[PDB]
RNA sequence: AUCGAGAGG
DNA sequence: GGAGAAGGAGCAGAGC
DNA sequence: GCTCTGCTCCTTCTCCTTCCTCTCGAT
């Protein structure tokens, strides 16, 4: 369902870790970034300003133990940690 | 012990002698069949036991009192006579009853009948406390007690740690605070209690091993782990014959 | 063997403790759903002590001399002298931690005070103490309603579970127990306005810093 | 123990107190002093004047409350009984069967006074849909439930089953288990497929319930 | 390529 | 080394 | 009353394993 989503709206560590990796790889590959490159080189760092300005175009699909699941914004997904 | 008698040392002494178990071959000195012995019920045969009066008065036996229980597990199919307890030799002195033919004579009877006897006595007699527990170790424990002030008092209590467990009798014990009782076997206080009582007392358990160097573990570590073997309503090992034995995956 | 038997035990999603069967193993992880790395072992100062001196430190009473709030320690403390409204929210206060006592006397039979819990409220006041320069000598702008009130909305808002079931919401209301007892004999009306003397600036802030950090400890799902 | 030697009628006493105290959890109209019989009291009323616990007249019958009947409406009547004979014989066990039936009773309980034969054994579930549960006197002379460790045991409705497995997304199969010989089940008569709520007080929290499932 | 032996951590 | 699994054996009851 | 039909109550048997790393020296 797109309501009553009973996960947490907090970006966990393992979430931020992937979406870093994911992002950052497509940046290494030459793909399009969508901040400003203010002397950046490394996809990493790249991807983490990104993450900082909730640039990076990503949904988690958390599913659940009985196979159903939630689908969550990168956006949406407070990144505090 | 019960509550009321946490500070009685006498009472601690007379749970002891409830629980402490003694079978009689632990306070005897000899047995010899004969063919200046003290008073159907009568053969020629003389089965002299001589008691350990020291022993005696250590357990706190009398004549009177194991003869009683001789007379309760031989019934009246021997025929038993004391000494006095202020005789020097504690002697028991004990005949074979027949009716069958001792009724009106004093005919031998067998001697394997008699040593039938002598081992239904010596090794079987169970003159005081409970099966499988021996030694019992009588001591005052500290624990807080909150005070009527509200505050926690540190209070001294007789606790009897005994060596051996047999909870389905000790717990039913007069005088015995049967909700503290605590043992070490997780299939004895599980059997007993229940699922939840042995999981808790496996805790408890793994708790005491590893706190026993000093180190700490989080609750939290230790917790789970106990859950996990008894998960199944019983107690699961982490053995081929636990974890394999499960409807898991195969290929792990 | 340890680490075979247990090693497919993972927290999910809907932060239960579960193997690769689904079979529940926890239905919170720990028995209160946080991060063993988040804990410090803190006080529950309730437990220990007099009944005398829990009232001493926790019974306040606007209508008796024997337990009215020295004026001196609010701006308008002269003016709650009296004031039977407050004196309902500090008798539903004082009953609370009183139940408290009763409460966690059952759950530490052995009156140990000393416990991990998450997020160390003792450090997180004194942060405030020195943030904002608490002046001792000055009388603040705390109000008794505002600090008790406050307390309790905090407590509304911690969360863990996020299920509107009422069996998720029991649930919530247990995990969080312990913390919550934490929470309320260490930010209570005399510890608030006569121990940690702070601005309403300076209480606030301790508050919403209470609650960051709390939702730093919950596990997060997929760990092992 | 002797007629002399009381001992053995304050065992039989004990457990009696301990049946008052399982039917009452159970769920049946027990009161608090029905429960709190005194020993002296306990010889007055059932001991014979020889010094003979007349254990015939230990019998009773029991009536679920109306709370527990709107809970679980389909909780019938108990009739609780022990046995006169050391040795229970399918002659015995075959009369108290024949009570239930006579009676209707939805559940009856039998106490054994010191051991049974399979004979009876086998008899004690040949009645459905009437369940006959079976103790023994020396296993009821202590009330388990007491003990300091074992937390409170929440026999839950179907009703509530239902939704706890809708809630958590379970199957039946997916909930920790006990079986049904587990002394604490078979302190609540739990039959396979019902979920107990177990409430415990914790370390990492004030308390914490914790679901299991009869096998 | 197996197989044993000697060690190191 | 200490399980567990398979097997022979020794008695309370029970039907003719 | 006496063998009979089951047991359940025992004794008497088969099965398994830190990590990791280095070298030589045999077949």
Same mark, same amino acid.
């Given at each position: 369902?797109?309501?009553?989503?009973?996960?947490?709206?907090?970006?966990?560590?393992?979430?931020?870790?992937?979406?870093?990796?994911?992002?950052?790889?497509?940046?290494?590959?030459?793909?399009?970034?969508?901040?400003?490159?203010?002397?950046?080189?490394?996809?990493? /760092?790249?991807?983490?300003?990104?993450?900082?300005?909730?640039?990076?175009?990503?949904?988690?699909?958390?599913?659940?133990?009985?196979?159903?699941?939630?689908?969550?914004?990168?956006?949406?997904?407070?990144?505090?940690? | 012990?019960?509550?009321?008698?946490?500070?009685?040392?006498? !009472?601690?002494?007379?749970?002891?002698?409830?629980?402490?178990?003694?079978?009689?071959?632990?306070?005897?000195?000899?047995?010899?069949?004969?063919?200046?012995?003290?008073?159907?019920?009568? =053969?020629?045969?003389?089965?002299?036991?001589?008691?350990?009066?020291?022993?005696?008065? +250590?357990?706190?036996?009398?004549?009177?009192?194991?003869?009683?229980?001789?007379?309760?597990? &031989?019934?009246?199919?021997?025929?038993?006579?004391?000494?006095?307890?202020?005789?020097?030799? %504690?002697?028991?002195?004990?005949?074979?009853?027949?009716?069958?033919?001792?009724?009106? @004579?004093?005919?031998?009877? @067998?001697?394997?009948?008699?040593?039938?006897?002598?081992?239904?006595?010596?090794?079987?007699?169970?003159? /005081?406390?409970?099966?499988?527990?021996?030694?019992?170790?009588?001591?005052?424990?500290?624990?807080?007690?909150?005070?009527?002030?509200?505050?926690?008092?540190?209070?001294? @209590?007789?606790?009897?740690?005994? +060596?051996?467990?047999?909870?389905?009798?000790?717990?039913?014990?007069?005088?015995?605070?049967?909700?503290?009782?605590?043992?070490?076997?997780?299939?004895?206080?599980?059997?007993?209690?229940?699922?939840?009582?042995? /999981?808790?007392?496996?805790?408890?358990?793994?708790?005491?091993?590893?706190?026993? +160097?000093?180190?700490?573990?989080?609750?939290?570590?230790?917790?789970?782990?106990?859950?996990?073997?008894?998960?199944?309503?019983?107690?699961?090992?982490?053995?081929?014959?636990?974890?394999?034995?499960? *409807?898991?995956?195969?290929?792990? | 063997?340890?680490?075979?038997?247990?090693?497919?035990?993972?927290?999910?999603?809907?932060?239960?403790?579960?193997?690769?069967?689904?079979?529940?193993?926890?239905?919170?992880?720990?028995?209160?759903?946080?991060?063993?790395?988040?804990?410090?072992?803190?006080?529950?100062?309730?437990?220990?002590?007099?009944?005398?001196?829990?009232?001493? /430190?926790?019974?306040?009473?606007?209508?008796?001399?024997?337990?009215?709030?020295?004026?001196?320690?609010?701006?308008?403390?002269?003016?709650?002298?009296?004031?039977?409204?407050?004196?309902?929210? %500090?008798?539903?206060?004082?009953?609370?931690?009183?139940?408290?006592?009763?409460?966690?006397?059952?759950?530490?039979?052995?009156?140990?005070?000393?416990?991990?819990?998450?997020?160390?409220?003792?450090?997180?006041?004194?942060?405030?103490?020195?943030?904002?320069?608490?002046?001792?000598?000055?009388?603040?702008?705390?109000?008794?309603?505002?600090?008790?009130?406050?307390?309790?909305?905090?407590?509304?808002?911690?969360?863990?579970?996020?299920?509107? *079931?009422?069996?998720?919401?029991?649930?919530?209301?247990?995990?969080?127990?312990?913390?919550?007892?934490?929470?309320?004999?260490?930010?209570?009306?005399?510890?608030?306005?006569?121990?940690?003397?702070?601005?309403? !600036?300076?209480?606030?802030?301790?508050?919403?810093?209470?609650?960051?950090?709390?939702?730093?400890?919950?596990?997060?799902?997929?760990?092992? | 123990?002797?007629?002399?030697?009381?001992?053995?009628?304050?065992?039989?006493?004990?457990?009696?107190?301990?049946?008052?105290?399982?039917?009452? +959890?159970?769920?049946? &109209?027990?009161? !608090?002093?029905?429960?709190?019989?005194?020993?002296?009291?306990?010889?007055?009323?059932?001991?014979?004047?020889?010094?003979?616990? !007349?254990?015939?007249?230990? =019998?009773?019958?029991?009536?679920?409350?109306?709370?527990?009947?709107?809970?679980?409406?389909?909780?019938?009547?108990?009739?609780?009984?022990?046995?006169? @004979?050391?040795?229970?014989?399918?002659?015995?066990?075959?009369?108290?069967?024949?009570?239930?039936?006579?009676?209707?009773?939805?559940?009856?309980?039998?106490?054994?006074?010191?051991?049974?034969?399979?004979?009876?054994?086998?008899?004690?579930?040949?009645?459905?849909?009437?369940?006959?549960?079976? &103790? *023994?006197?020396?296993? %009821?002379?202590? *009330?388990?439930?007491?003990?300091?460790?074992?937390?409170?045991?929440?026999? %839950? =409705?179907?009703?509530?089953?239902?939704?706890?497995?809708?809630?958590?997304?379970?199957?039946?199969?997916?909930?920790?288990?006990?079986?049904?010989?587990?002394?604490?089940?078979?302190?609540?008569?739990?039959?396979?497929?019902?979920?107990?709520?177990?409430?415990?007080?914790?370390?990492?929290?004030?308390?914490?319930? =914790?679901?299991?499932?009869?096998?």
């Amino acid at each position: 369902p797109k309501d009553q989503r009973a996960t947490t709206p907090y970006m966990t560590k393992y979430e931020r870790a992937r979406i870093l990796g994911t992002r950052a790889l497509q940046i290494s590959m030459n793909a399009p970034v969508f901040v400003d490159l203010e002397g950046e080189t490394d996809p990493l /760092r790249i991807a983490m300003k990104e993450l900082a300005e909730k640039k990076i175009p990503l949904v988690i699909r958390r599913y659940l133990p009985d196979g159903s699941f939630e689908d969550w914004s990168v956006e949406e997904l407070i990144v505090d940690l | 012990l019960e509550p009321g008698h946490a500070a009685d040392q006498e !009472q601690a002494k007379l749970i002891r002698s409830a629980i402490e178990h003694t079978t009689l071959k632990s306070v005897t000195i000899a047995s010899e069949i004969y063919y200046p012995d003290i008073h159907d019920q009568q =053969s020629p045969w003389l089965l002299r036991l001589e008691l350990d009066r020291a022993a005696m008065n +250590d357990k706190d036996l009398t004549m009177g009192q194991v003869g009683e229980r001789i007379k309760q597990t &031989f019934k009246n199919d021997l025929f038993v006579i004391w000494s006095e307890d202020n005789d020097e030799k %504690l002697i028991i002195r004990c005949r074979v009853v027949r009716p069958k033919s001792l009724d009106a @004579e004093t005919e031998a009877e @067998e001697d394997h009948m008699l040593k039938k006897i002598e081992n239904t006595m010596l090794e079987n007699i169970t003159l /005081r406390g409970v099966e499988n527990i021996e030694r019992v170790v009588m001591m005052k424990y500290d624990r807080k007690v909150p005070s009527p002030t509200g505050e926690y008092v540190k209070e001294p @209590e007789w606790v009897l740690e005994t +060596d051996g467990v047999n909870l389905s009798e000790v717990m039913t014990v007069p005088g015995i605070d049967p909700t503290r009782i605590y043992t070490n076997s997780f299939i004895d206080i599980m059997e007993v209690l229940g699922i939840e009582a042995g /999981r808790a007392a496996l805790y408890k358990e793994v708790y005491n091993v590893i706190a026993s +160097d000093g180190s700490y573990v989080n609750y939290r570590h230790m917790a789970l782990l106990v859950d996990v073997m008894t998960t199944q309503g019983g107690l699961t090992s982490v053995t081929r014959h636990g974890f394999n034995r499960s *409807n898991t995956g195969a290929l792990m | 063997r340890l680490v075979k038997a247990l090693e497919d035990i993972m927290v999910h999603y809907d932060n239960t403790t579960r193997n690769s069967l689904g079979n529940v193993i926890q239905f919170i992880y720990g028995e209160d759903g946080m991060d063993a790395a988040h804990i410090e072992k803190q006080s529950l100062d309730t437990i220990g002590g007099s009944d005398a001196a829990f009232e001493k /430190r926790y019974r306040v009473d606007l209508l008796n001399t024997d337990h009215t709030l020295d004026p001196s320690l609010l701006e308008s403390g002269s003016e709650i002298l009296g004031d039977l409204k407050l004196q309902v929210l %500090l008798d539903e206060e004082y009953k609370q931690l009183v139940k408290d006592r009763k409460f966690l006397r059952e759950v530490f039979v052995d009156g140990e005070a000393n416990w991990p819990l998450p997020v160390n409220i003792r450090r997180i006041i004194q942060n405030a103490q020195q943030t904002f320069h608490i002046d001792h000598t000055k009388p603040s702008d705390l109000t008794i309603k505002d600090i008790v009130l406050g307390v309790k909305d905090l407590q509304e808002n911690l969360l863990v579970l996020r299920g509107k *079931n009422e069996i998720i919401q029991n649930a919530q209301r247990d995990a969080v127990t312990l913390f919550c007892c934490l929470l309320r004999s260490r930010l209570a009306t005399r510890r608030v306005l006569q121990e940690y003397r702070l601005t309403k !600036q300076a209480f606030d802030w301790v508050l919403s810093n209470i609650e960051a950090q709390f939702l730093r400890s919950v596990v997060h799902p997929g760990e092992m | 123990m002797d007629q002399e030697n009381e001992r053995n009628i304050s065992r039989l006493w004990r457990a009696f107190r301990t049946v008052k105290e399982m039917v009452k +959890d159970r769920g049946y &109209f027990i009161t !608090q002093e029905e429960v709190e019989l005194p020993l002296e009291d306990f010889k007055a009323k059932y001991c014979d004047s020889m010094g003979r616990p !007349q254990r015939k007249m230990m =019998s009773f019958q029991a009536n679920p409350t109306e709370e527990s009947i709107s809970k679980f409406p389909d909780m019938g009547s108990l009739w609780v009984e022990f046995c006169d @004979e050391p040795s229970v014989g399918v002659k015995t066990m075959k009369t108290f069967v024949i009570h239930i039936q006579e009676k209707n009773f939805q559940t009856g309980i039998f106490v054994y006074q010191n051991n049974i034969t399979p004979s009876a054994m086998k008899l004690v579930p040949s009645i459905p849909p009437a369940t006959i549960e079976t &103790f *023994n006197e020396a296993a %009821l002379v202590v *009330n388990i439930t007491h003990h300091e460790l074992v937390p409170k045991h929440i026999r %839950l =409705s179907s009703d509530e089953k239902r939704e706890l497995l809708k809630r958590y997304r379970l199957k039946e199969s997916q909930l920790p288990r006990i079986q049904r010989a587990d002394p604490v089940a078979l302190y609540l008569g739990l039959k396979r497929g019902e979920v107990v709520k177990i409430i415990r007080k914790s370390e990492t929290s004030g308390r914490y319930a =914790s679901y299991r499932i009869c096998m």
